[PDB]
Amino acid sequence: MVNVKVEFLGGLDAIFGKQRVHKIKMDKEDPVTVGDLIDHIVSTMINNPNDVSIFIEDDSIRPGIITLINDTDWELEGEKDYILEDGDIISFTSTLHGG
Template sequence: MVRVIIEFLGGLDVIVKKQRQYKVDVQLDGKDEINVGDLIQWIVDNLIEHEGDVNVFLENDSIRPGILTLINDTDWELEGEKEYVLEDGDVVSFTSTLHGG
């Protein structure tokens, strides 16, 4: 199990029950280490209410382009993206950079 903070910013909160921040314990059967890829699937399974909203968050099994993903205020690309192993207290932020007009 890992205890993390997940943030949905830039309007993404509308797909996760209109809550911007979650403090969650993520536990997956049979896994000692939980990585960001596991967390993304956990978000899809537990926080996104409507199946159609998954496409707002994911594209081709990864975070949709236009969503800035940070792990402890560092771009996830520098941290190994989905392979980054989460630790207690990590903050994972998803910020939409796309805005309607």
């Protein structure tokens, strides 16, 4: 079981009922990855399926969204492969600069 927070920034809150910060309890036994977290967000937290394409394209984070893991570019942590620890904070920012 792992507890993390996710932040939906650069306007992404619009697909999450205008709520920017979400507390997430991942019930899965360790290890739980950022890939698992994204699956969870898509499966349970996007309340209009028409908005899923705003968050993911071809089952990957949508081009134009920057993902930071504890204030760090997720590339430096293995991206989807990063293993969540209790208290981690993951933010997603929509921006024209995003990759």
